[PDB]
Design a protein around this ligand. Sequence first.
Ligand SMILES: Cc1nc(C(=O)NCc2cccnc2)cnc1OCS(=O)(=O)c1cccc(Cl)c1
Ligand SMILES: N[C@@H](CCC(=O)O)C(=O)O
Lengths: 275, 273
Amino acid sequence: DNHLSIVTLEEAPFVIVEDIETCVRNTVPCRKFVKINNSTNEGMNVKKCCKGFCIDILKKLSRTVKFTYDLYLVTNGKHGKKVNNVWNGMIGEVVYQRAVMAVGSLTINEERSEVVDFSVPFVETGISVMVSRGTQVTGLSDKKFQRPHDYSPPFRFGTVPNGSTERNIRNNYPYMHQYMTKFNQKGVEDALVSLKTGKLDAFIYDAAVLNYKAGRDEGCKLVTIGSGYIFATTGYGIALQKGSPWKRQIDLALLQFVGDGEMEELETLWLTGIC
Amino acid sequence: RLKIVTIHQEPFVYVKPTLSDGTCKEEFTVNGDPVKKVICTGPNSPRHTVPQCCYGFCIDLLIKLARTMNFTYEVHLVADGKFGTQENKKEWNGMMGELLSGQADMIVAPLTINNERAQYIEFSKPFKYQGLTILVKKGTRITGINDPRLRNPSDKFIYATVKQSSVDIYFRRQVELSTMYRHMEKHNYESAAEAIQAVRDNKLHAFIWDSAVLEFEASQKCDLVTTGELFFRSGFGIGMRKDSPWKQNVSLSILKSHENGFMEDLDKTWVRY
Ligand SMILES: Cc1nc(C(=O)NCc2cccnc2)cnc1OCS(=O)(=O)c1cccc(Cl)c1
Ligand SMILES: N[C@@H](CCC(=O)O)C(=O)O
């Protein structure tokens, strides 16, 4: 009743997962359902530990709004995608009432707000483009992105599919999206290696994550275009069930956190970069 | 028909007198398109209301929300020219007071989302992401929010903000800024335009205000510069009463406009050129 089921997903530096049998220091306990094999539905919850920027936000919210929680990591998808009118990922966990809320690098967009409630944004994000330093790309609407076959050889660029970034590209730039799919990257780290090794000219992804990776790139060779420009500005938000009685208190707490300068310490704790 | 309240705040809300025939002059944007204008009433002390002409970023956003959600509207300027602050009993002034008293059904203005206001009204998702910065006369050398002339102030360097604004509460509520707040309380200005003019005429040496406003002023008036980046992030939101039936579709339309480039076009039309 006052003990809430909360789902999360690992994406450094906002949610970081570690092994353990008692979580220590700034980490909180988070469980992950791990299957026995692929011929059964059997599995077991592995006790792990979670930390990061969004975990510190959850620790603050738990202290301020006064609630306890059982945190667990999503295993059915990632952030959230509507497949055959059925939501998976963290959104799906909230939509189908397996979790009271979702905390992490979860992007607020319109189609998700139709099925879940979002708190006020607390981490500014959107769509950015990471390239090797010096690449001439004006933005998302650059002709190398819009009309990629007007160039020989064509520009090579991709994203990590099934997230809010691909969803936006699929609706806004049809030709760009269908050309992009052959450059889909399994994850951020694969995309970074694809960039540095010359297999990829540009990587389009969540703004806050690319901002963090740019500041920590070895030699500071990978940069975001426009000096950290963001298309379709939005933010990470706490997802809640529609009509959740927790939303108002979560919003007031988040606005009170930023209003009293408490965000700066979490920023210097998790988000700083040398570059 | 919704009663819209707003406030003079370029480049978000321009305010010009009507023509002799009670109409607004036909003007054109930076891209050759016609500038959409609406008639807005407001005072020019007693407050004699006169029809005037409104246009800008927020007016374009208001027109989009009206066509998208199918509602009619009448626009008027806030009577006391203030954004909104809660000052035995407490009382809201400015656009906040007009929204809660029923004088307005919706606030369409560069209205900062803070904990104080969200306790009484409903904010949409932010339609503009910006922050706080400092405007100074070109040649004035201060590092930023942590400059000694600001943290250990005297009468040799005057800085202030707008009275009864979100920035005014910002320095009042944070005890870490108490030194700065007691310096500004004696010099806060009634409007941003007056404070900006005071920096031009070297009557005010630093203006702490919204970055989307101050950076636009520095782009059009080259004797003014902004020092440092943003020492604080803030955002503007549509303001409605908590029982409004339009609040969910308003917020969804804000997200849609962000995600299809409409908010970016407005930023190109009104902010960055
Ligand atoms: C809750 C809240 N957090 C912040 C804030 O600075 N968060 C920390 C942070 C760290 C790194 C990157 N981005 C943000 C600001 N304002 C807030 O509430 C006001 S708002 O209008 O919703 C809003 C305006 C602008 C940005 C955002 Cl994220 C939200
Ligand atoms: N943060 C994104 C995932 C990464 C991306 O799509 O850029 C989401 O919530 O869907």
